[PDB]
């Protein structure tokens, strides 16, 4: 309850390295270099602890003036999906 050994930025990245998929509400982490914020689970090839800092939630990370990560916050994964030509107006 009122206790948790060592809450150091160390084990912050331990829970976040483990990819703890269910740590939504537990905190967020914020990679200043892309100006995005995430849940610990960020499955894409990690950006270092050293560019990354930890909040309570994404409204705090919004307080930092960031945007939700395309993988973590909505879950906005676009892999499979066609990389269709590009040019606009295609009625056929
Ligand atoms: Zn992410």
Curated annotation (Swiss-Prot):
Induction: Up-regulated by methylated Ada itself in response to the exposure to alkylating agents.
GO molecular function: DNA-binding transcription factor activity; methylated-DNA-[protein]-cysteine S-methyltransferase activity; sequence-specific DNA binding; zinc ion binding
Ligand binding (DNA): 34, 43, 45, 67
Residues annotated for Zn(2+) binding in this entry: 38, 42, 69, 72
GO BP: DNA alkylation repair; DNA damage response; methylation; negative regulation of DNA-templated transcription; positive regulation of DNA-templated transcription
UniProt KW keywords: Activator, DNA damage, DNA repair, DNA-binding, Metal-binding, Methyltransferase, Multifunctional enzyme, Transcription, Transcription regulation, Transferase, Zinc
Catalytic residues identified in the record: 38
Record's comment describing the protein's domains: Consists of two domains. The 20 kDa N-terminal domain repairs the Sp diastereomer of methylphosphotriesters and, in its methylated form, binds DNA in a sequence-specific manner. The 19 kDa C-terminal domain repairs the mutagenic lesions O6-methylguanine. Each domain retains its activity when separated form the other.
Record function comment: Involved in the adaptive response to alkylation damage in DNA caused by alkylating agents. Repairs O6-methylguanine (O6-MeG) and O4-methylthymine (O4-MeT) in DNA. Also specifically repairs the Sp diastereomer of DNA methylphosphotriester lesions by the same mechanism, although the methyl transfer occurs onto a different cysteine residue (Cys-38). Cannot demethylate the other diastereomer, Rp-methylphosphotriester. The methylation of Ada by methylphosphotriesters in DNA leads to its activation as a transcriptional regulator that activates the transcription of its own gene, ada, and other alkylation resistance genes, alkA, alkB and aidB.
Family label: In the C-terminal section; belongs to the MGMT family.
Miscellaneous comment: This enzyme catalyzes only one turnover and therefore is not strictly catalytic. According to one definition, an enzyme is a biocatalyst that acts repeatedly and over many reaction cycles.
Protein's recorded name: Bifunctional transcriptional activator/DNA repair enzyme Ada
Species: Escherichia coli (strain K12)
Portion of the parent chain present: 1 to 92 of 354
């Amino acid at each position: 309850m009122k206790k948790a050994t060592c809450l150091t930025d160390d084990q912050r990245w331990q829970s976040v390295l483990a990819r703890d998929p269910n740590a939504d509400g537990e905190f967020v982490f914020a990679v200043r270099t892309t100006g995005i914020f995430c849940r610990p689970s960020c499955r894409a090839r990690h950006a270092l602890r050293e560019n990354v800092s930890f909040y309570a939630n994404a409204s705090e990370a919004l307080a930092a003036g960031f945007r939700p990560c395309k993988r973590c916050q909505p879950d906005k994964a676009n892999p499979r999906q066609h990389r269709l030509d590009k040019i606009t107006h295609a009625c056929r």
